[PDB]
Paper text:
The membrane-bound protein [name] is an integral component of the bacterial Type [name] secretion system (T7SS), which is a determinant of virulence in important Gram-positive pathogens. The protein is predicted to consist of an intracellular repeat of forkhead-associated ([name]) domains at the N-terminus, two transmembrane helices and three P-loop-containing ATPase-type domains, D1–D3, forming the C-terminal intracellular segment. We present crystal structures of the N-terminal [name] domains ([name]-N) and a C-terminal fragment [name]-C from [name], encompassing two of the ATPase-type modules, D2 and D3. The observation of protomer contacts in the crystal structure of [name]-C together with similarity to the DNA translocase FtsK, suggests a model for a hexameric [name] assembly.
Author numbering: 1 to 18, 21 to 52, 55 to 79, 83 to 195
Write the structure that this text describes.
Amino acid sequence: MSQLWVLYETYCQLFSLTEKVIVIGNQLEHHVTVSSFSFRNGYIQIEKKSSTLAVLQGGRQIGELKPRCSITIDVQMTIAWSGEEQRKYVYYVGQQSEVLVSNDPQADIETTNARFSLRKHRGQWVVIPDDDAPLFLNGVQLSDAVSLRNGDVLLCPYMQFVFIEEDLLAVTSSEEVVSSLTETMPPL
């Protein structure tokens, strides 16, 4: 997958780049629809080059995005790009009651992209976010702990976390993930 993340207010939309020149604007026809914005300085155009994405705001270029890079833009919105390639790890966590995701040395999943913990209570995982790192549950920023159901999606820039089952956690990332958890698979 090649995905862009569109972050604004307390939302994050994820959009797949399958197309060739896409547009983020406030109509339902656009590829990515942010209705709460004006776009008085132009819709946002993202086009592929054939390696990088050209970012234009009035038909004029305001940046280029390389893989795993982002841009912030005044209309206040961030766009980030994963790059052309992404991989999928699945961990078995049936013998865990807690998963820490942060940049700490003792993190179960090590990343400079997210900081949050997952905790198991009576067969249910709860997500507890941290005040610093912005984290999204089905596209909406979390402001407190929330008990998860299967196929809830946790997103931050460049990563996704999905419980397939109570005992299996899939992580997708544009970088190799560093984990002390039990892999159930070779990464794909």
